[PDB]
């Protein structure tokens, strides 16, 4: 993915290019006259006498000082942006690499499992490993099961039906199991819950005793 895409790392290349441009601009400004007879200071000094040379020199000083001040101001603004990026990278290291995050889309798309750091020129690369659900199927569901006049709810899952039989499964991966007293809990009668359906709830100790 990286090797076949020369521009994949543009985010880091852009930083390098911006810094290089700023320096090249600062140097090229030395060629400007700024109203002086010449941008070359030595030529002014060699041709003109003091009371006249100083007038020409002040023009170059003003221009060059202004150019240098502009450069520094831009560097301060750019530095602030880089600091913000570094602060984010440091946070991701702590939360994505040194632990497992529950923050959505913080450590890549999907459900975060783990991440690995890699070094780079003036930057860092994170490899985010995530879990993605696949191949979903349609099931019929219900909020509760009614049995012996009592309402039963899932302890850690959802009630589903394959069209003929009811099962209870974990939510993020289809794995149907028989509905029993060990995977449900009871609260109130069947007259309150809207959408409650009739089904048997198996008690493992019934056939034993």
């Amino acid at each position: 993915s990286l090797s076949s895409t020369p521009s994949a790392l543009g985010k880091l290349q852009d930083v390098v290019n911006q810094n290089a441009q700023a320096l090249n601009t600062l140097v090229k400004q030395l060629s400007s006259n700024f109203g002086a007879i010449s941008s070359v200071l030595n030529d002014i000094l060699s041709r003109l006498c003091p009371p006249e040379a100083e007038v020409q020199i002040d023009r170059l000083i003003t221009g060059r000082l202004q150019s240098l001040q502009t450069y520094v101001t831009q560097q301060l603004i750019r530095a602030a942006e880089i600091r913000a990026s570094a602060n984010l990278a440091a946070t991701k290291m702590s939360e994505c690499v040194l632990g497992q995050s529950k923050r959505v889309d913080f450590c890549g798309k999907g459900y975060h499992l783990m991440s690995f750091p890699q070094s780079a020129p003036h930057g860092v690369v994170f490899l985010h490993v995530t879990y993605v659900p696949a191949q979903e199927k349609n099931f019929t569901t219900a909020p509760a099961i009614c049995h012996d006049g009592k309402a039963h709810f899932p302890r850690e899952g959802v009630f589903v039906s394959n069209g003929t039989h009811w099962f209870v499964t974990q939510r993020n991966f289809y794995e149907p199991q028989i509905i029993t007293t060990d995977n449900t809990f009871v609260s109130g009668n069947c007259d309150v819950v809207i959408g409650i359906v009739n089904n048997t709830v198996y008690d493992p100790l019934q056939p034993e005793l």
Binding site: S1, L9, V15, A89, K92, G108, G110, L127, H128, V129
Partner: peptide, 14 residues
């Protein structure tokens, strides 16, 4: 399910 690996790139220094 599938296992996915993606990249994220951040600048750190000048």
């Amino acid at each position: 399910f599938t296992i996915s690996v993606t990249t994220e790139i951040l600048p750190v220094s000048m």
